[PDB]
Amino acid sequence: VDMYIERAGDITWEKDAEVTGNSPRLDVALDESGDFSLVE
Amino acid sequence: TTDGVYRVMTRGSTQVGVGVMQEGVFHTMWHVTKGAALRSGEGRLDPYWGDVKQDLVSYCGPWKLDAAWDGLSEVQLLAVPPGERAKNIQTLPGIFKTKDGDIGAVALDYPAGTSGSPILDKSGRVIGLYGNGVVISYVSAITQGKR
Known part of the structure; x- marks a missing residue:
């Protein structure tokens, strides 16, 4: 089972990007296994 | 080794994730590779640091990315x-x-x-x-x- 990498682009900001998505404010906890969960 | 964004592929072939090459270090998420060594062409990239709680891993050297969201900007x-x-x-x-x-x-x-x-x-x-x-x-x- 071999894992390999392939270059896909430069790391650059693009002035013409699509703009989308909300900005939710969430209470979360992060456990030892790296899992985020909601808290109330 | 060139700076840039890269696909992480496995073998038909399947894309399991993405990572960032910067300053000679490859950065990706632990859950993508589980720290397994990576092929790049005829070369090999060996894991250097990883942490399951942060869900991160670096190859060939220590984690290099240090910028942070400013809390206001897109x-x-x-x-x-x-x-x-x-x-x-x-x-x-x-x-x-x-x-x-x-x-x-x-x-x-x-x-x-x-x-x-x-x-x-x-x-x-x-x-x-x-x-x-x-x-x-x-x-x-x-x-x-x-x-």
Whole structure:
């Protein structure tokens, strides 16, 4: 089972990007296994 | 070894994630590779540091990315989905509020093979990687390591 990498682009900001998505404010906890969960 | 964003592929072939090459170090998320060695052409990249709780791993050297979201500005996800050209998605992050402080978060839902894609600030610095998050719709932390 071999894992390999392939270059896909430069790391650059693009002035013409699509703009989308909300900005939710969430209470979360992060456990030892790296899992985020909601808290109330 | 060139700076840039890269697909992480496995063998037919399947894209399991994405990562960032910067200053000779490859950065991706632990859940993508589990620290396995990576092939790059005829060369090999060996793991150097990793942490399951942060869900991060670096290859060939220590974690180099250190920029952080400014808490006010829009950012861009440089998404590299399976089968698609690298593309920039601009968004205003929300916030994960945790007992250890606030983390930027992006309410963007791309295929799992996009995990490891970098999130950028306006000057083009990587402020974290996409693909560890929570469901409210999926919301990804902006996950950054320590340099």
